[PDB]
Design a protein around this motif. Structure first.
Motif, PDB file in Angstrom:
ATOM      1  N   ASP A  56       0.838  -1.284  -0.029  1.00 11.09           N
ATOM      2  CA  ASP A  56       0.103   0.026  -0.061  1.00 11.09           C
ATOM      3  C   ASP A  56       0.909   1.210  -0.010  1.00 11.09           C
ATOM      4  N   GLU A  57       2.055   1.126   0.479  1.00  6.58           N
ATOM      5  CA  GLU A  57       2.864   2.187   0.804  1.00  6.58           C
ATOM      6  C   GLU A  57       3.386   2.656  -0.688  1.00  6.58           C
ATOM      7  N   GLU A  99       1.782   1.870  -3.536  1.00  4.69           N
ATOM      8  CA  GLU A  99       0.575   2.326  -4.141  1.00  4.69           C
ATOM      9  C   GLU A  99       0.417   3.641  -4.107  1.00  4.69           C
ATOM     10  N   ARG A 100       0.297   4.074  -2.642  1.00  5.45           N
ATOM     11  CA  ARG A 100       0.220   5.312  -2.206  1.00  5.45           C
ATOM     12  C   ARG A 100       0.967   6.414  -2.849  1.00  5.45           C
TER      13      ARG A 100
END
Ligand SMILES: [Pb+2]
Lengths: 15, 15, 15
Positions: free
Chosen positions: C1-2, C4-5
């Motif tokens: 998620d890191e 992707e963010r």
């Protein structure tokens, strides 16, 4: 490959 | 790791 | 998620 595909698109624009 | 490296390059070029 | 963010932030920035 999804994340890499999005990175590729960003690279196409920025680099 | 490889994808993080490429993201870092993109970020640097914006910053 | 890191990662992707971080991609999402780049996508937003150049739009
Ligand atoms: Pb930023």
């Amino acid at each position: 490959d999804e994340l890499e595909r999005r990175i590729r698109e960003l690279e196409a624009r920025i680099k």
